[PDB]
């Protein structure tokens, strides 16, 4: 059930340089059982969304060339609308005369004025700012992105979080989609000093992962353990109370 941007989909909540240490964080992530087919318009376009790709295979691209779309296929929301001069951009919920069918030719600030290069984006509207993350490696095969174990190391950024649409890590240079099946839980990281690190782990694939997160470790030793108490499901209250 794994077909990759690999166990990326762990974005980095902040720049705090934890190094070579365990820490599990609860944040907004994405659920299980994401399957899809290939159709007709009376092999992967825009995915079930969030910000990028899924969880296991290999690739390296030099492929993408063109665009006329919206990232949510709307362009009323944040499209991949490039009037963005790569130093200043425009992103328009900014209300202009929208055309219901796009075209091609031959205030909404970035400077501050109107991707297998896996630069994550920002439209997390905690009181209205805009930004970008950044990492890089490409797509020439079924799905991919690479392996390691941790988040990376801090130099310059301005972080607030993301709202774009195709669950991540993204697809670019150096019909309907297909994605796999991922369990959302906490994510353990180990930032080695040299910073050669990508991955994490989940807690409820199975009782194996339940022990893995309960013991706060990775090398589970032979034995027997008990996880969180299973309350026998009280579907409804009891008919004992008076009136």
């Amino acid at each position: 059930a794994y077909t990759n941007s690999f166990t990326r989909g762990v974005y980095y909540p902040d720049k705090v340089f934890r190094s070579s240490v365990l820490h599990s964080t609860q944040d907004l992530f994405l659920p299980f059982f994401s399957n899809v087919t290939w159709f007709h318009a009376i092999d992967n376009p825009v995915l079930p969304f969030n910000d990028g790709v899924y969880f296991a295979s290999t690739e390296k691209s030099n492929i993408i060339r063109g665009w006329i779309f919206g990232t949510t296929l709307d362009s009323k929301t944040q499209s991949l609308l490039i009037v963005n001069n790569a130093t200043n951009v425009v992103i328009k919920v900014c209300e202009f005369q929208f055309c219901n069918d796009p075209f091609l030719g031959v205030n909404c600030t970035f400077e501050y004025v109107s991707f297998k290069n896996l630069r994550e984006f920002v439209f997390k509207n905690i009181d209205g700012y805009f930004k970008i993350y950044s990492k890089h490696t490409p797509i020439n095969l079924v799905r991919d992105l690479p392996q390691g174990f941790s988040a990376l190391e801090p130099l310059v950024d301005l972080p607030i979080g993301i709202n774009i649409t195709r669950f991540q890590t993204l697809l670019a240079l150096h019909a309907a989609y297909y994605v796999g099946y991922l369990q959302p839980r906490t994510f353990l990281l180990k930032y080695n000093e040299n910073g050669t690190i990508t991955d994490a782990v989940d807690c409820a694939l199975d009782p194996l992962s339940e022990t893995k997160c309960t013991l706060k470790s990775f090398t589970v030793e032979k034995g027997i353990y008990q996880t969180s108490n299973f309350r026998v499901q009280p579907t409804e209250s009891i008919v004992r109370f008076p009136n």
């Binding site: 009782p207 032979k222 034995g223 996880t227 108490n229 299973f230 009891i238």
Partner: protein, 115 residues
């Protein structure tokens, strides 16, 4: 009132394998592969005629182990082989040869000091 109970997990070492079973404590399977036992519900285990000593203890007088390859199975406790001797008013046994053995023993002595 309704019952409740812990959810227990039985597993071998990670490098050994990754297949895992699950144990439910105090619950009744009628009220929830299935292996109904007094302890509760088990998956992957069977009443197996052959027995061994306890390797991974589970409780309630039953022990489980990674066994037939090796898989999580349940078996009844086994103590050891039986034996008997012939005792008579005019019987006696005597030894003739010997041997030398070496054994070890470990004990803790102390602990660190802090402030």
């Amino acid at each position: 009132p309704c019952s409740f109970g812990g959810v227990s997990v039985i597993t071998p070492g990670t490098n050994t394998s990754n297949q895992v079973a699950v144990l439910y404590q105090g619950v009744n399977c009628t009220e929830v592969n299935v292996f109904q036992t007094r302890a509760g519900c088990l998956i992957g285990a069977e009443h197996v005629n052959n027995s061994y000593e306890c390797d991974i203890p589970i409780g309630a007088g039953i022990c489980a182990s990674y066994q037939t390859s090796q898989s999580i199975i349940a078996y009844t406790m086994s103590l050891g082989a039986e034996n008997s001797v012939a005792y008579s008013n005019n019987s006696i046994a005597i030894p003739t040869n010997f041997t030398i053995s070496v054994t070890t023993e470990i004990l803790p002595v102390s602990m660190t000091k802090t402030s």
